[PDB]
């Protein structure tokens, strides 16, 4: 089972993580059934 929990929070702090409490709601459970040992973030470039 692949559990994805998520939470959206409106913050206005410039640099670091804000200090507070916010429990993450369960968003989606995925029937993947695969081995995962490594991950990588995906970003977006800005072209001009």
């Amino acid at each position: 089972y692949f559990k994805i929990y998520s939470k959206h929070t409106p913050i206005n702090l410039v640099r670091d993580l804000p200090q507070g409490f916010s429990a993450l709601e369960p968003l989606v459970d995925l029937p993947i059934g695969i081995n995962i040992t490594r991950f990588q973030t995906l970003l977006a470039l800005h072209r001009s």
Binding site: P31, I32, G33
Partner: protein, 49 residues
């Protein structure tokens, strides 16, 4: 394939459905027949397992 051919020579469309169970969670399920809801009585309830 001619329309005047015999039944042993007429075209037959064949669809073969293959059902396998793997160790991943099974997600192609059948329709789960739902009994109408009855309230205010001592009944045996089965809600989502």
């Amino acid at each position: 394939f001619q329309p005047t051919n015999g039944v042993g020579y007429q075209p037959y469309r064949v669809v073969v459905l293959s059902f396998e169970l793997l160790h991943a969670p099974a997600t192609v399920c059948g329709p789960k027949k739902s009994t109408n809801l009855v309230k205010n009585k001592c009944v045996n309830f089965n809600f989502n397992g």
